[PDB]
Design a protein around this motif. Structure first.
Motif, mmCIF file in Angstrom:
data_model
loop_
_atom_site.group_PDB
_atom_site.id
_atom_site.type_symbol
_atom_site.label_atom_id
_atom_site.label_comp_id
_atom_site.label_asym_id
_atom_site.label_seq_id
_atom_site.Cartn_x
_atom_site.Cartn_y
_atom_site.Cartn_z
ATOM 1 N N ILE B 13 -3.046 -7.939 -5.404
ATOM 2 C CA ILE B 13 -3.465 -8.161 -4.028
ATOM 3 C C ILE B 13 -2.683 -7.229 -3.114
ATOM 4 N N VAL B 14 -3.360 -6.688 -2.105
ATOM 5 C CA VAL B 14 -2.674 -5.885 -1.101
ATOM 6 C C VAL B 14 -1.822 -6.817 -0.252
ATOM 7 N N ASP B 15 -0.523 -6.545 -0.188
ATOM 8 C CA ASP B 15 0.361 -7.368 0.624
ATOM 9 C C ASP B 15 -0.153 -7.400 2.061
ATOM 10 N N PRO B 16 -0.256 -8.581 2.681
ATOM 11 C CA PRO B 16 -0.731 -8.647 4.075
ATOM 12 C C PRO B 16 -0.041 -7.690 5.035
ATOM 13 N N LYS B 19 -1.379 -4.244 4.454
ATOM 14 C CA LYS B 19 -2.662 -4.106 5.138
ATOM 15 C C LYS B 19 -2.464 -3.909 6.636
ATOM 16 N N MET B 22 -1.430 -0.436 7.305
ATOM 17 C CA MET B 22 -2.550 0.491 7.160
ATOM 18 C C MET B 22 -3.531 0.406 8.321
ATOM 19 N N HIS B 204 -1.923 0.353 -6.120
ATOM 20 C CA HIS B 204 -2.547 -0.960 -6.272
ATOM 21 C C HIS B 204 -1.938 -1.773 -7.416
ATOM 22 N N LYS B 210 -6.065 0.269 -3.334
ATOM 23 C CA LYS B 210 -6.673 1.118 -4.341
ATOM 24 C C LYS B 210 -7.051 2.458 -3.721
#
Lengths: 388, 386
Positions: B13-16, B19, B22, B204, B210
């Motif tokens: 999972i993308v760490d909050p 995100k 980004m 990822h 990803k």
């Protein structure tokens, strides 16, 4: 920067809010690997299918054709050139590539490296309209030519290449045809069957998709040795875990680009024409390339008093983002002075200001840019000891 | 019912907060970093901070290069094919040493290089699921161009003795590349102490997005570009920068090192609880020694059941896991064990791979234990021999 105005859309574009929203779930709420067999992995499968469908629809590809997702148009161009070199030159009767002098560096540097490998490369120069015609390509095609790579539309001038006729003469000669079509999507009608191309490169961030995702269209699944070996991703043609956010966003962005094509041809074209006419009202300014064969969003202006780089820096100080293009002096049939497109490496090349609109450009931005452009030209000509 | 992700070796999972780091670089900050205007240069401090985070997380020095790629597959293809071009096609070498247990981006590239006439030694892996240094030294020839041995295995979690492999590589003057994708966030990663010349990684795998990866190149060593063209990444990898991907990868690598130092016990302890609970089931075998395994991974072989059937039943129960190849053997004491094997081996059977993350909770672990026991009995009453 009394007003911030982006007119460098040929370099990159803003990610459309709708594209960002389409991508948003595929980072932390839907994160499974699409190659996994469990529900976490397969959850994103409908989104990938819809994005692939959107890509096939946006460029008019048929079901027998392949659309392979790459990381960027640079990867696509390297893949086409090096794969055709490996298949038809190192392991075939060929050793010759035909391309143009105005291609993007991902094509030209790859071609210089292939030349380092002993490949014959003809860099066809560009004509007074800023394109290369089909009969020239036919003049340079011999029985040992493996591939013809000519971009669809130019990124510096916006000039649209006669890809259909080039493909006609390529099919007559049985020569594979690849086009760098990065500048085409969202700016002109794109039908890969009507253009007759065998390969087509594109990049999402050039049409309001995210950076880090591109594509290669391959007609009829034609064999082309993988640039990225490994897993069976993308029908086994390009390995690596799929960039699910990038893929979803690229599909959504291509769908939006097809929708906005009529708007880009109407309104964006009108704003481009206003800006270009206003600029050309300044004495000793020259627009590179005929408008009638140009993408509707692009202008390339040469000013004989000012330098291009200083002009760009003044424009940035006024909050306006623009770029450069190579040009050189010539004359029309009446012998009136004009500025024509040239390869950047040319002795004869000087710097011209490239202004590129998007579907998000407003008339307020255009009026402000007109005012700031006139102010900059007058400021930089008033310091010159030489300008007449 | 409960949905539980324990296939973190496949993706994470993308760490909050990754995100969130980004998020601005899609629509609020979109200029091309190669542009000279303010729109383009606006993202420059973020890119510099991300590169700093990457250099810090893997202990790279300033003279070293860290080139941003699109994925670990691109990094591996770049290393292998570039060294083939430099030292094999345009040098006196023709031999590469690697393992049978490598990721497909390594093995398939090596099969294509074999198609190019390169001799490739796929070193077999031992009962611990790794390849020791003395084997690599025994297989190094005067024409060996490269040694490519992954840092840690993705199926078993086994950690390779990369530092000693690099010692003997330096002794023989052979370049050493490691696929370190499974290493970041799971074990201490110091590219100077590992002595590797090349290192591949993928965001990822440690809670980055990803579509972004990297290649560490020690001391700026020459390596012919896989992506020619634009003059990007110090001229080593062309293409417009994946600015969101780069920002997120830097943030994710920083967070991975932070949680490696700070929370090694939490992930290790929940892995140990789950593994001890599963091995309490009769006729179960954990592949590979725990003492040499990444703290988040278990690979369980269940007698009577197929690895695939176990995966399917767990998935029906809402638990996501994967598979790994193993086969029966015996230790020196002669009791029966399951050891790591290449997937292509005729003798290989399928085992269940369970891989945790720092986001795994104890409720997930308890639920997984209960459902794993339930699945073992459900499928064993179905078994034809057990």
């Amino acid at each position: 920067a009394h007003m911030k105005v982006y007119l460098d859309n040929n370099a990159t574009t803003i990610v459309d809010p709708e594209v960002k929203a389409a991508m948003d779930p595929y980072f932390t709420q839907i994160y499974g690997n699409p190659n996994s067999l469990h529900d976490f992995g397969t959850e994103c499968h409908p989104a990938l299918r819809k994005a692939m469908d959107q890509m096939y629809e946006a460029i008019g590809a048929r079901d027998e054709d392949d659309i392979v997702v790459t990381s960027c148009a640079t990867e696509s161009n390297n893949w086409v050139l090096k794969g055709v070199y490996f298949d038809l030159i190192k392991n075939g009767d060929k050793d010759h590539i035909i391309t143009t002098e105005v291609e993007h560096p991902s094509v030209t540097a790859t071609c210089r490296w292939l030349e380092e490998q002993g490949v014959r490369v003809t860099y066809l120069p560009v004509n007074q309209d800023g394109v290369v015609e089909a009969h020239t390509v036919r003049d340079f095609i011999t029985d040992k030519t493996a591939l013809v790579s000519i971009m669809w539309a130019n990124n510096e001038t916006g000039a649209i290449f006669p890809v259909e006729e080039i493909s006609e003469i390529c099919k007559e000669k049985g020569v594979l045809f690849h086009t760098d079509g990065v500048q085409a999507i969202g700016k002109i009608p794109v039908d890969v069957i009507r253009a007759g191309v065998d390969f087509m490169s594109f990049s999402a961030h050039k049409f309001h998709g995210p950076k880090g995702v591109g594509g290669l269209y391959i007609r009829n699944g034609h064999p082309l040795t993988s640039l990225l070996h490994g897993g069976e991703h993308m029908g086994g043609r390009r390995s690596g875990t799929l960039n699910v956010p990038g893929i979803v966003g690229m599909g959504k962005a291509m769908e939006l680009a097809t929708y906005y094509l009529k708007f880009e041809e109407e309104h964006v074209r009108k704003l481009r024409d206003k800006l270009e006419d206003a600029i050309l009202e300044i004495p000793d300014t020259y627009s590179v390339g005929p408008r009638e064969n140009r993408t509707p969003n692009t202008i390339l202006v040469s000013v004989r008093g000012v330098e291009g780089e200083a002009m760009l820096w003044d424009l940035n100080r006024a909050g306006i983002a623009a770029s450069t293009g190579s040009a050189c002096a010539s004359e029309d049939l009446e012998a009136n002075p004009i500025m024509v497109a040239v390869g950047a490496d040319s002795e004869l090349a000087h710097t011209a200001v490239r202004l590129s609109l998007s579907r998000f450009t407003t008339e307020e931005e255009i009026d402000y840019t007109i005012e700031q452009f006139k102010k900059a030209v007058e400021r930089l000509r008033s310091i010159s000891s030489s300008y007449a």
